[PDB]
Amino acid sequence: MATGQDRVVALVDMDCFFVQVEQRQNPHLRNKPCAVVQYKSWKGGGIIAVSYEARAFGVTRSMWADDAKKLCPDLLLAQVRESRGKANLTKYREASVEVMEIMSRFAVIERASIDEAYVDLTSAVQERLQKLQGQPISADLLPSTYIEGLPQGTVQKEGMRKQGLFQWLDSLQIDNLTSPDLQLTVGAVIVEEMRAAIERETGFQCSAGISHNKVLAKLACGLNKPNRQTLVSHGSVPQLFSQMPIRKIRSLGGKLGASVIEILGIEYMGELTQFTESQLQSHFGEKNGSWLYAMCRGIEHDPVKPRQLPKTIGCSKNFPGKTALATREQVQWWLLQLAQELEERLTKDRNDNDRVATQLVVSIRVQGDKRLSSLRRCCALTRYDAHKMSHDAFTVIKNMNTSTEWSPPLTMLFLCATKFSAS
DNA sequence: ATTATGACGCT
């Protein structure tokens, strides 16, 4: 008939990663309300990462620092580095590389963002099942693992975890669960080990979710934070989904999700099972329809792509609102600034990863535009030279000036190296 | 004036 349980996939998330990096570096920041901020003068600078001690007070991403101090007077703040008049994330990219390299020892890794990796454990699980000469799995192996939906049928939370885990293993040991449930379990054992190795070797804690696909792994990861992991089995999906808002599933958090809500007249992920594949296809098109039909039953095929390195390297800076760029000499200077950071990062890349970028994408925004990008233009990237690239980015945007004066002003500059080639 | 990134889809 059908089955969507052949893979074991994990999604790991470095808990408030930027804060961890700063906290490792500055011991005084550890186990305290803490946040990372970039810039300082306009309203204290924007928060981009928040510790759980801080979140408890209601501090969030995309909050001005001055407002964050109101919610949390004892909030400690670390400031992102500033080179060539802009924020620079090199410390965090390098800290991110430390982690990915440890992760690749265990399994195939897909870098999803600077703080998230997807992990395909299917092969590692099979091997591990030989290594265990029929040996049964004890709770001692899963010391930070939650089993979603369990226990079924004590006050402290660790108390609840224990009970859920014991119920699951007792059922596993007596052949009441399924083969895929065994595979997920073994998968979770490997993730504990992977998570223990990350912490020993970097000092960074993190959360993780384990299921049969990427969407479920990412959802599972969020169920129990910080520094805990959660196992979502195929059998838990109907209950989990029955009360799970559509927007919390990955890729339904925007307009597609909003239109699924208002067109079909539903709220929760489970409610999609009522509809036929063709029906969903008729509202949202062929690709989305098919994907929704299977996803709401806990089935997804999107593979874990083997890719530790990013496939584009870019520099970006916004210039709002009166800060907008208005002269030619000024536009050249920021282009030069962005280019110089881009050069340094490209060289480090070539030495590290045996590859060369070949294309330069230049993107722009003008004041009072309906869209986060106004124009996007390409040119050839032949040599790692800031002046060349800056001069060229100027060449492909020169025509957008309507008026030594630049009108209308530029609210955004962006330079991205792409189309990488080995050697 | 919710940054500075980064992935992938549609046409």
Place this chain on the structure above:
DNA sequence: AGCGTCAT
């Protein structure tokens, strides 16, 4: 190729 959506 250029633009849009979706993430942190």
